[PDB]
Amino acid sequence: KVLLKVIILGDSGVGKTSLMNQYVNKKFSNQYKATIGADFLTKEVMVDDRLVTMQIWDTAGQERFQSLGVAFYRGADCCVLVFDVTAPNTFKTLDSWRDEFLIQASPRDPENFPFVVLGNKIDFENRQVATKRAQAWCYSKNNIPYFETSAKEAINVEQAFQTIARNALKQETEVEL
Ligand SMILES: Nc1nc2c(ncn2[C@@H]2O[C@H](COP(=O)(O)OP(=O)(O)NP(=O)(O)O)[C@@H](O)[C@H]2O)c(=O)[nH]1
Ligand SMILES: [Mg+2]
């Protein structure tokens, strides 16, 4: 019985909120309800012989909803990085999201911290960002795992979150100290 904090970072419009309500509640909606502030949802899951409670913190990509020195980050056990395959700008921002996270949570051993990158929205056909340069990018950065997901049609949502889970748990375990 173990608690995992998991934070979902990335630009506004990538579908951070939609991946959440899909994974947790198996529901999808077209209605873009801009995420004000930062809340969470819990999903209970089984990872490797162990019941895990995953607290999933969904944040506001916009700077329209920033207050104001967000230290909700720390105690994080896995940071999830979401870009939109139809928008090259949301992929370019990933380092900046990754840097910002590491400043804020500043976990010890920062470069073994579990990141997961989700190429959301592959249910569309106008993908701009190939699988190949995002596969590269996740590899350039300590070989972090990468899925191409769709919250709408629910492709790789479950699979990806099994990895989010398992990696969150390894990291939690690493607090032997
Ligand atoms: N076709 C399709 N639309 C998606 C997908 N994921 C999200 N959307 C749509 O994209 C828009 C933005 O989604 P949203 O979840 O709000 O993204 P967000 O990153 O959480 N935005 P915010 O940071 O402002 O909450 C919404 O219209 C949403 O329904 C997807 O996989 N496929
Ligand atoms: Mg959101």
Q: What is the CATH number of the domain that holds 7?
A: 3.40.50.300
- Domain tally, the chain: 1
Q: Which ligand lies nearest the alpha carbon of 61?
A: 1
Q: How far is CA 64 from CA 29, 37, 47, 61, 68, in A?
A: 22, 9, 37, 9, 12
State the sign of the Cα–Cα–Cα–Cα dihedral 106, 112, 113, 117: positive
Choosing from 7, 31, 32, 81 the residue with most ligand 1 atoms within 8 A of its CB, the one to mutate for a pocket test is 32
Q: Which two tokens stand for residue 149?
A: 């997901």
Contact 165, 4 (CB under 8 A): yes
109-129 in b/e burial notation, b at 16+ Cβ within 10 A? Answer: eeeebbbbbbbbbbeeeebeb
Going from the Cα of 32 to the center of ligand 1, the distance in angstroms, rounded, reads: 6
Q: How far is CA 107 from CA 7, 132, 162, in A?
A: 14, 30, 22
Experimental method: X-ray
77 is in an annotated binding site: no
**CB distance 119 to ligand 1 below 6 Å:** no
Strands ordered across the beta sheet of 50-58: 39-47, 50-58, 2-9, 78-84, 115-120, 146-149
**CB distance 123 to ligand 1 below 6 Å:** yes
Domain extent for 40: 1-177
**Long-range contacts of residues 124-132, Cβ cutoff 8 Å, at least 24 apart:** 124/85, 124/86, 126/86, 127/85, 127/86, 128/85, 128/86, 128/87, 128/88, 129/83, 129/85, 129/88, 129/91
**CB distance 171 to ligand 1 below 6 Å:** no
